[PDB]
């Protein structure tokens, strides 16, 4: 029910929850010409 409240002490269960959440949705199928990038060149995947 409440991650950040109950498991407010252990900082690894929260990261596990976040990883499971981001790796839960099917990636959309859209290749585009100009998208978001970072300084090095990696493209951004999602928004939180």
């Amino acid at each position: 029910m409440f991650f950040m409240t109950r498991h407010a002490r252990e900082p690894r269960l929260i990261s596990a929850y976040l990883s499971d959440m981001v790796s839960c949705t099917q990636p959309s199928v859209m290749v585009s010409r100009i998208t978001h990038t970072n300084t090095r060149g990696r493209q951004v995947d999602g928004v939180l």
């Binding site: 199928v29 859209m30 290749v31 585009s32 010409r33």
Partner: peptide
């Protein structure tokens, strides 16, 4: 500017599982 990728194909001998068996063709 924005397209859709269709038919993500896949081969077998590039997978990696093709090191437990010796596959070979025969007519």
């Amino acid at each position: 500017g924005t397209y859709c990728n269709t038919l993500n194909f896949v081969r077998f001998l590039e997978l990696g599982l093709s090191v437990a068996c010796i596959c070979t063709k025969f007519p």
